[PDB]
Amino acid sequence: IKVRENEPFDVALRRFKRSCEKAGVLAEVRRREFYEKPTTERKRAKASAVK
């Protein structure tokens, strides 16, 4: 990110890295990416349908 902002300074404006980056990168890339069992690792989204 090229940070350039208005004159006030020392806020450092990186509070939104949570969505301005896939923050898990370099947490999961300096190690053998497993990636196996991937779709059932997406399975949990379906389980929440309720009424």
Binding site: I1, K2, V3, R4, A12, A27, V29, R30, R31, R32
Partner: protein, 116 residues
């Protein structure tokens, strides 16, 4: 000797020894320090408190080269390593631009296997 004014700084946020360098935007290095140069060792060296000391060694050695404004380049997964740029800010250099330069790959070399 030489005047740099608006220099650039480089930090390496490794889980181990943090690297801090001051550069004059032409690749020639003005000064440099580690969390390990002062004799710190072990896990006393990986806490964010530890990264400050190298930042003040760099700052207080580079006074003669005369930094007035500065840039800083940050790469690394180390948590809370911007304490170093807090230290440079508190040292009086007007920090104007910041970039993250973390060497991400486009899935090239194979990463080492993990421990259990």
């Amino acid at each position: 000797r030489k005047q740099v004014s608006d220099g650039v700084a480089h930090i390496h946020a490794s889980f181990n020894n943090t690297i801090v360098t001051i550069t004059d935007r032409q690749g020639n290095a003005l000064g440099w320090a580690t969390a390990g140069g002062s004799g710190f060792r072990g896990s006393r060296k990986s806490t964010p408190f530890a990264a400050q000391v190298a930042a003040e060694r760099c700052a207080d050695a580079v006074k003669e080269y005369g930094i007035k404004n500065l840039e800083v380049m940050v790469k690394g997964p180390g948590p809370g390593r911007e304490s170093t740029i807090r230290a440079l800010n508190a040292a009086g250099f007007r920090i104007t631009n910041i970039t993250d330069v973390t060497p991400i790959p486009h899935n090239g070399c194979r990463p080492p296997k993990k421990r259990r």
